Design a protein around this ligand. Structure first.
Ligand SMILES: COc1ccc2cc(-c3c(-c4ccncc4)nc(-c4ccc(S(C)(=O)=O)cc4C)n3C)ccc2c1
Length: 286
């Protein structure tokens, strides 16, 4: 058990601030009493010991995934009726919040670094048989060194609900088993990645202008999205998008394959992102 049921968390940890109320809840800024290190925390009051299981599964995921580009789990406590989960503090904030502060999208050299780094994360995740299912610029966090961190496994953990003859089975039912089970569902993250790259270029994902209920339909019947003004962007970018955003997941490539694409195969430094994070920090000061 990575959740220490013993040991009250106010022995080691100490709260110092808030950060934001977005959808799921509040997020505190936390400090380590011994080492003095910063962490980002969630203190959850639990409606149900049944539901709790979802957050425990997230913790298990986080504890298994040691990779440079995925947030470190610094601690996990259940004490009183509350659940404490401490994450490596990422002081550059999320890329979407970055685009709000600078009031613009990322440049192509910036997107390349993010894309390259996400591919390495996904490729790691997919070889551990984990799917993110919730990739968007708001879940890509930045460190001051200009590296990303993938952050929220709240959807991915809910889907490891799967932890809990068919001669008469319908076609569309068959396909939603092989699609949702294995070799095929890795490709969903690949699609989302493609969409996160367009969000980064254009600030808003495709179909932002549509009401949420109608997007699902639009995604189903539409041609795959492309960049609004293809003048602005390199052929390598458009072609990367072209092949990542294949509606047919069978032919859509894996992360490991896309790491061999010219758009990211020559990315040796994270400088462009180091520069963007610095511009953001300075803008926050005003
Ligand atoms: C269960 O373990 C945890 C604990 C805390 C978590 C906090 C965030 C997080 C972090 C974060 C910030 C600094 N260091 C790390 C993370 N920032 C956010 C965050 C907060 C608000 C907003 S907003 C623009 O809607 O106001 C956006 C983000 C990304 N979240 C959700 C993200 C995932 C977290 C996971």
């Amino acid at each position: 058990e990575h959740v220490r049921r013993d040991l009250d968390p106010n022995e080691v940890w100490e709260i110092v601030g808030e950060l934001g109320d977005g959808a799921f809840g509040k997020v505190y800024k936390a400090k380590n009493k011994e080492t003095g290190a910063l962490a980002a925390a969630k203190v959850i009051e639990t409606k149900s010991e049944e539901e709790l299981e979802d957050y425990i599964v997230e913790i298990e995921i986080l504890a298994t995934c040691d990779h440079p580009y995925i947030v470190k789990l610094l601690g996990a406590y259940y004490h009183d009726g509350k659940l404490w989960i401490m994450i490596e503090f990422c002081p550059g904030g999320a890329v979407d919040a970055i685009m709000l502060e600078l009031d613009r999208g990322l440049t192509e050299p910036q997107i390349q670094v993010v894309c390259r780094q996400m591919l390495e994360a996904l490729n790691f995740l997919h070889s551990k048989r984990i799917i993110h299912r919730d990739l968007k610029a708001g879940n890509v966090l930045m460190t001051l060194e200009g590296d990303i961190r993938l952050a929220d496994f709240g959807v991915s953990a809910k889907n490891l609900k799967t932890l809990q003859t068919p001669y008469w089975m319908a076609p569309e039912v068959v396909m939603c088993e092989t699609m949702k089970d294995t070799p095929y569902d890795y490709k969903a993250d690949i699609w989302s990645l493609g969409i996160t790259l367009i969000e980064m270029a254009q600030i808003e994902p495709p179909h932002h202008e549509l009401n949420p209920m109608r997007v699902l339909l639009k995604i189903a019947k539409s041609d795959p999205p492309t960049l609004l003004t293809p003048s602005k962007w390199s052929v390598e970018f458009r072609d990367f998008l072209k092949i990542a955003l294949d509606k047919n997941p069978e032919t859509r490539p894996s992360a490991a394959q896309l790491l061999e694409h010219p758009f990211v195969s020559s990315i040796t430094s994270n400088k462009a992102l180091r520069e963007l994070v610095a511009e953001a920090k300075a803008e926050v000061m005003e």
